[PDB]
Design an enzyme around this catalytic site. Sequence first.
Site, mmCIF file in Angstrom:
data_model
loop_
_atom_site.group_PDB
_atom_site.id
_atom_site.type_symbol
_atom_site.label_atom_id
_atom_site.label_comp_id
_atom_site.label_asym_id
_atom_site.label_seq_id
_atom_site.Cartn_x
_atom_site.Cartn_y
_atom_site.Cartn_z
ATOM 1 N N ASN B 131 0.777 -1.241 0.000
ATOM 2 C CA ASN B 131 0.000 0.000 0.000
ATOM 3 C C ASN B 131 0.810 1.295 0.000
ATOM 4 O OD1 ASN B 131 0.479 -0.479 2.750
ATOM 5 N ND2 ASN B 131 -1.486 0.377 3.393
ATOM 6 N N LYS B 154 11.801 -8.541 2.110
ATOM 7 C CA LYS B 154 10.821 -9.326 1.382
ATOM 8 C C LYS B 154 9.602 -8.445 1.205
ATOM 9 C CE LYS B 154 7.151 -12.354 1.009
ATOM 10 N NZ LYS B 154 6.802 -11.850 -0.342
ATOM 11 N N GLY B 206 2.060 -4.716 7.471
ATOM 12 C CA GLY B 206 1.135 -5.447 6.626
ATOM 13 C C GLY B 206 -0.109 -5.908 7.347
ATOM 14 N N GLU B 228 3.606 -3.643 12.433
ATOM 15 C CA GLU B 228 2.761 -2.517 12.054
ATOM 16 C C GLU B 228 1.637 -3.057 11.193
ATOM 17 O OE1 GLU B 228 3.046 0.743 12.809
ATOM 18 O OE2 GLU B 228 5.079 0.954 13.636
ATOM 19 N N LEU B 229 0.457 -3.212 11.778
ATOM 20 C CA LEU B 229 -0.622 -3.902 11.075
ATOM 21 C C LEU B 229 -1.764 -2.957 10.735
ATOM 22 C CD1 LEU B 229 -0.440 -7.043 13.381
ATOM 23 C CD2 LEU B 229 0.877 -6.594 11.321
ATOM 24 N N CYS B 262 -3.865 1.724 6.551
ATOM 25 C CA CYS B 262 -4.077 1.192 7.887
ATOM 26 C C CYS B 262 -4.676 2.268 8.795
ATOM 27 C CB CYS B 262 -2.769 0.645 8.462
ATOM 28 S SG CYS B 262 -1.403 1.799 8.386
#
Lengths: 455, 455
Positions: B131, B154, B206, B228-229, B262
Amino acid sequence: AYQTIYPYTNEVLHTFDNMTDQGLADVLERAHLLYKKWRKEDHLEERKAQLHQVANILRRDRDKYAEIMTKDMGKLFTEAQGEVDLCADIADYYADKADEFLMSTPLETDSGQAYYLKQSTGVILAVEPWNFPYYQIMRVFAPNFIVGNPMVLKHASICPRSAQSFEELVLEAGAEAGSITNLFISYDQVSQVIADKRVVGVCLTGSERGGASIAEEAGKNLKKTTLELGGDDAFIILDDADWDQLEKVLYFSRLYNAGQVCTSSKRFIVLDKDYDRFKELLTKVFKTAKWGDPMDPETTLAPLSSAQAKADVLDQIKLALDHGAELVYGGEAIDHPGHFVMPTIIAGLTKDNPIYYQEIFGPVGEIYKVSSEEEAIEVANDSNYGLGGTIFSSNQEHAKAVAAKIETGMSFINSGWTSLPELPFGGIKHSGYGRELSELGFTSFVNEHLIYIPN
Amino acid sequence: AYQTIYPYTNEVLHTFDNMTDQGLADVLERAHLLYKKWRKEDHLEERKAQLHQVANILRRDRDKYAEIMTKDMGKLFTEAQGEVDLCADIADYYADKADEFLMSTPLETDSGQAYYLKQSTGVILAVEPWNFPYYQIMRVFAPNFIVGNPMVLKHASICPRSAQSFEELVLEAGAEAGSITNLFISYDQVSQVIADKRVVGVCLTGSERGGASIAEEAGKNLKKTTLELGGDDAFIILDDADWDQLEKVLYFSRLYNAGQVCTSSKRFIVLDKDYDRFKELLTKVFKTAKWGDPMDPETTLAPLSSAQAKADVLDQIKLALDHGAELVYGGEAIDHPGHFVMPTIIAGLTKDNPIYYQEIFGPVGEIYKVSSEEEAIEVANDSNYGLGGTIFSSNQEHAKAVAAKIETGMSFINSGWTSLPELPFGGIKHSGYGRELSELGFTSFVNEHLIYIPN
């Protein structure tokens, strides 16, 4: 099973009932409601006073708490008294530092007004070990209680009286029920606690196998962790070491708590020139050990904490010798029902010897010979652990310079380990991550909450 | 599976080959040796200069990098330019703050002299999402590069050109090979990386599904993490809100990046008295959306980042309606090969409607009705998430007071989300743990190394 079995006599003193699933649910709900209460109403001054009272009761009843620890896990009564003393200081420290540590933090920005708050988050699971049954609780209870995170405690199976009495202590001090609750629970119940949405963090002190198990379960459930694990600390004797001062710290450095210390001085690293001299010195020091009744003031070596602990240590010594190490001193059996291991010194560990890289949680001195200061550092850092360590040098700048080159969380100069409320404690590699004590140990489970007002 | 498919046209623009096992081994060793080099030699001024040069190249070639992001994941070219701008500033910030952030910290103790160093630890695995393909990398690359932790990356399978070009950017800036390396790797290989002794921490940004998988694997291997979600941020409109100011921020607050943020303003919480007015205001704002070619400067709504993303959002809208929610506006198909979802507003979510508690990663406004400020706070906190949120109130001291009561990591006053290098960013609950940016985001993978010299 949760049992007090005295390591000196191998006899059962207490047996405790396991907590039921419903009892556990009730405890988590009570803890969650207390978290919410402390968020909704300002009870900080009460908690500060209650934490001071915890310290006060520890002072008043020091010998009671010291004996509880000795009877649970075998440590010298004098060492247990010292552990109480340190717990007193940690409690007073966080109560005294509460206002400063909880203050809002302004953020420098020309884009608007910004700061962050330090807020409670919820119920914290503490998983703590038998080697310092009170100190390892206090390190995490004191700061979490101050911020307002209620705690639930899973303690070692062999120190259930220590665990139970800690809860009783906190209640006696006037803290609301739920501030800390001991959980006599199974590993499966621990997994449920970690998966429970009321639980918002897990702090563990213990072995790396327990650490990996708990951290794996926490990650599955998106729970933050800190891990305080084992060590294989290098005690490095430089070419300008003061050998008089060296002798005075050696007994403590390896034999305090019968060597069952994550920051024990487990790998002595000595220059070739000094090797024979150090073998003789460490042998001399180890010979002074007097094993026996840990309640007796004359006793200077405690039995290990369990029959399994003793078996494991004896097997590691045997493994070392079977793979070519030299038996320098000791290694002979102590004929007594208590879980005694005599002070033993090994040397000649090569890299293909498994013990070269293994932590021995007992009274086993290990001498690593090196050819240079560069190699001393290389060997020190060739480790899966990195908790503490010692640099012995009569030149302070020399000592500090070598310390910085060690891959480890703590370096003690001209001394074995110590801990004080104002000093951060933690490691790297398989010794874990995060820090306890000092202000660093205050924020592990706080919500650093940004408030931002743009221009 | 690393493939760029332009979300506007659904055309494959790039297919990349996976990195081999040998390739990955070579990368991990290069990174480890770079860590050792930076420990044993002071290269900080070089890294500072190189990071400023990363910023310089991003500025000079802004349109190139913006277009790369648009073509990978569909966001408005103008938004992608804004993302580059923030990356420039983050890079310059950590370069500027390097010496301050790396200073030794004296510790006050009357028992001796003590301080702690802030040292690098090793190779860090960064797992980052589509994002904000550049900004999410920069948030962690900048501080870790300055510290001296080499990074392996990754990235999301759908933004492989963003990922590769970021490595190329750092090399172009003159940073040593290994400073950051992109990994086009399988989940098998990701787990290999986490288990590798050369890797000493994992930072992930993510979704919580990926977060849980990665954190579980990290835990098993004793590796420190930050997460960090997602969020389901409450945008709370109080009775003294400035409605002119409110109108000005609404479009950005929910429709920026097509709602795929988010910290998007996902739950609008409005008082009874203001509900009808807010419904028509939000409807008015949403009807201004112009979807189309994200490279076209007149386009104000992008397609979503993939076919599956569109399908997931559409399914959530229908789930909401099937469980009794009201369709206020939108909810109609856009006929176009691109992954477009039209702005849609729902209301009347009840606690037994699953969408009441779910994050919708798309352009879906949600209006929650409450009868008091106390209820607004309760609704805001009744969430599995706690990342950001907004308090709207003309009285900023009142807004600050209410913000403190919200269980969340960030509160934006009279505005939607923002991010600046000097402001810490992160959440609680299922939004994760740890902080990125500011000085808080500098120390996540630093060894806080105590040196203690007793008197």
